[PDB]
């Protein structure tokens, strides 16, 4: 039994995230999406809302489950008997910062990190830029799962 | 069930490569090291020598095997019933170049690529730089497995 | 009838920015400098506009306007669909690439990047303000008028 | 009377290149694609020119010409002083920045960079040829005509 | 005769910083570690604590001394009759940012900056990441000098 | 007595190189410029021509001397009782490749490397691009020392 954790705030989940989830679920026996709860910055969607949106979008992935997490990521990973993290990367700058984090996580807890390159179509989408664009009436419907877009239009009204 | 291919020319394999092999073998049920040969340019080591040096330094990894090939990596991967490549990266520059090859490989064959960050200790070792330094007499004994170092010095002498 | 928009906060405009404006004005019939209203900086929007107008008096095909909201709406409402932005580093390119691709996706607005003049590789509004605040001489990095205005805000 | 030159070896032209040509043609009155003569590639200069002309038939303000020597001389001899070049990565920007600054220094010719369309992030003439040589399907990455021509060179 | 200044906030000093100090002290007749304080934002450690932690881990470097300051680094450097800054770098991203500050510092005051590449083992340690990991209970004992680690845990508790 | 080696092919020396030489000579008691002899690629100027051009350009630097070298750079450095290299850097990409080399040189011989950021004015000049531009009649006189430019015009006729 192999497995990996896919961490993020997912506020909201985007099609770029979903592409990573699908690719991880195709290669590991189990995948856990870890939705981070951050006591400091409370974003647009509640943790439960974020989990619901991810579950809707990943309904066809039976070996993927969604859970909330808090604190040190490598504790979350090890408490679930795993020792791999899977994350998506878009740029070389992304890789430099994430490499530091990955080496740190491997040093402190023996947890490894596997990165996957973004699908070309989603190279420019992020949760933050999608929210910003949508806030001013830009159309981000092609960048988000169908249900997320509906939920996002409600938060904006 | 799960599996990945670790590709390279491995001319010769380094401790950086071995670290990647070990980490892939810890996370996938089977790992194949693909020694990719250019039929139009001989390297320093013959295919048999490259394979022998890898086998001698991976004897403790029961789910790893070593095979050579040429042509498209994605054909090597698919003909073994697999759909994943695992590659080590050191730098952001590495990532931008490998991203392009990864996206091409996914485009033409649906094969995914997972990258892993180098161990810090091997951030500066490459087959090419180790060969160049050794050619001019520098001490590279700590960067190569025992199965490689003196065979390398032999080739140079 | 070609045209492009040069966006920024310009707080204050530097010689790096001016170089980009001049180069955009040399290649497009119409240039609009778009000054962001983002409501915490040093100069008011009006002051920023004035400083740019002062420094671009020799560019007959350039005008300066403020705006809020999506840049692509600013651009499209003026009948244009190009943005001209200056870049210093590869890091800059990676971040601006994402914005550029988003802007093209949502509004069909293209982005043209121009490399910084070598002499202004290290110049930014932020660093100029910081250095001047602690007494450093930035007079060679800012339009003559801007510099005097900056001294006034600090004293 | 605005204008820009789009330079390259184009061996062969890809959909990435074509995207850049279309975007240059939308923003400048005149575009010249400059095909480098560099005397070792797959297609002759004439074949490369033909392939680009075939693929740009819907761009009335674009023409295709070959050239040798300094790009800035090609540009200036045609009365222009802008180059439009597509970029994929930050690494690309760092290398092209140096060329751009050199070209501005020696000839006053400016360079405008445009970000790759997302769909063509991984497309290059070199990689397309390599993949096709070993049997990979690159038909979605090249103009329809180019693709058939490529099959012909390999078979 | 020759000399350089090694600047930073050192909140706290790490083994990466100490490596830079040692390498600067090996190549310049005198080295001054400049602990730069923001009078408007307190860090984790007071100035006296930062200086004490550096002194305790540099006692074997006879030509190094530690002083605090604020405002323009180039003024700190020139008022000591020096004209060189020595700074460690980990990444290409680091280099682009530090290049801009170095060129500004040379412009306004004629002060030069020499960069040195991180030791591989410390490629992933930073004061900020060590503090964040420790805040959530991760083991950072191997990344910080003895003069720092338990004082850090004390601050957090 | 402190010191450093400034290595390169210098074919020909440019104003960017000279700026690095000046800055090194200002901070180290002695500087040796090492002009590399490469048996494979014989460039535009002979080693003796390259040395002569550098000596002309550095006439005002009494603590800098110019010598040819061959083979492993760290041997050249240590044979002269030194253990520091000084090199100029223009970009983040430069730093990534040079960092590998610097870590390798420190690993194999204990020789350190100090990098300096290019002067802004010379960010785009290199020996290779200057030669290429000049070959086709471009004016590179503002990028090269006065004497080099004269010598370059002769090699081109
Ligand atoms: N949002 C988002 C996102 C996350 C991961 C990757 Cl690889 C691509 C993306 N656009
Ligand atoms: N050689 C080599 C090598 C290969 C992969 C990684 Cl991650 C690190 C390395 N030094
Ligand atoms: N400020 C500023 C600035 C803006 C654009 C460019 Cl290309 C260079 C700069 N120094
Ligand atoms: N080939 C090619 C190509 C050229 C320019 C751009 Cl921006 C993208 C590409 N794929
Ligand atoms: N912290 C820290 C640090 C500082 C400088 C260098 Cl080169 C490496 C580091 N890890
Ligand atoms: N040529 C050359 C050169 C060498 C070093 C530096 Cl820092 C800048 C340059 N232009």
How does this model look, in words?
The structure is a homohexamer. Chain A has 157 residues and is of the alpha/beta class. Chain A has one domain. Chain A contains six helices and five strands. The radius of gyration of chain A is 15 Å and the shape is globular. At the A-B interface, helix 1, strand 4, helix 4 and strand 5 of A face strand 4, helix 4 and strand 5 of B. Residues 14, 16-17, 20, 86-88, 116, 120, 123-125 of chain C line the site of one 2-azanyl-4-chloranyl-benzenecarbonitrile. One 2-azanyl-4-chloranyl-benzenecarbonitrile (I7Z) binds at residues 14, 16-17, 20, 88-90, 118, 122, 125-127 of chain F. It is classed as transferase. Keywords: CoaD, ppat, nucleotidyltransferase, transferase.
Which compounds are bound in this model?
Answer: 2-azanyl-4-chloranyl-benzenecarbonitrile
> Could you say how many structural domains of chain A there are in total?
1
Please give the most extensive interface between any two protein chains, plus how many residues each contributes.
A-B, 31 and 32 residues
Oligomer: homohexamer
Q: Per the principal axes of the C-alpha atoms, what is the gross shape of chain A?
A: globular
The count of β-strands of chain A is 5
| Spatial extent as radius of gyration of chain A | 15 Å
Fraction in beta strands of chain A: 15-25%
State the share of residues found in helices of chain A, binned by percent: 40-55%
Largest sheet of chain A: 3 strands, parallel
The order of strands across the largest sheet of chain A is 1-2-3
Query: Tally the helices of chain A: what do you get?
Result: 6
Structural class of chain A: alpha/beta
N-end to C-end Cα span of chain A: 45 Å
Element pattern of chain A in H and E: EHEHEHEHEHH
Keywords (chains A, B, E, F): ATP-binding, Coenzyme A biosynthesis, Cytoplasm, Magnesium, Nucleotide-binding, Nucleotidyltransferase, Transferase
Main location (chains A, B, E, F): cytoplasm
GO molecular function, one term (chains A, B, E, F): pantetheine-phosphate adenylyltransferase activity
Binding site for substrate (chains A, B, E, F): 9, 41, 73, 87
């Amino acid at each position: 039994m192999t497995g990996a954790v896919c961490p993020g705030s997912f506020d909201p989940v985007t099609l770029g995230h979903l592409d990573v989830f699908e690719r991880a679920a195709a290669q590991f026996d189990e995948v856990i999406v870890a939705v981070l709860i951050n006591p400091n910055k409370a974003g647009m969607f509640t943790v439960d809302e974020r989990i619901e949106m991810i579950r809707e979008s990943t309904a066809d992935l039976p070996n993927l489950r969604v859970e909330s997490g808090q604190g040190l990521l490598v504790d979350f990973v090890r408490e679930r008997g795993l020792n791999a993290i899977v994350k998506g990367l878009r740029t070389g700058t992304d890789f430099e910062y994430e490499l530091q984090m990955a080496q740190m996580n491997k040093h402190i807890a023996g947890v490894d990190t596997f990165f996957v390159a973004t699908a070309p179509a989603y190279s420019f989408v992020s949760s933050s830029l999608a929210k910003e664009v949508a806030t001013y009436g830009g159309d981000v419907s092609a960048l988000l799962p169908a249900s997320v877009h509906q939920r996002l239009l409600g938060k904006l009204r």
